[PDB]
Amino acid sequence: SSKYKGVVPQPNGRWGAQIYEKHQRVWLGTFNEEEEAASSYDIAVRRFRGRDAVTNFKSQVDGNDAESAFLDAHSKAEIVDMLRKHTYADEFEQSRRKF
Secondary structure, eight states: OOSSTTEEEOSTTOEEEEEEETTEEEEEEEESSHHHHHHHHHHHHHHHHGGGOOOSSOOSSOTTSHHHHHHHTSOHHHHHHHHHHTOHHHHHHHHTOOO
């Protein structure tokens, strides 16, 4: 139903995100809003596929390479965990704090 890559319906009107790598599903979490799920796919596909990634949306927080650096600072598994825990955004923002 969703037009967004990676986005699947979940119960209670919620939305899941998933990515496949070589026919292996990786679950990316459950989200209240459709575009939130789509944005979670985008984070995963950027980290998983790099320059080969095709995203739902253009990135809005990578003008200074900060988000690319953040993705490149982590393993795939760490990114997946941040997405599922809904901590990715807060951890990314902390990484932008100036000292």
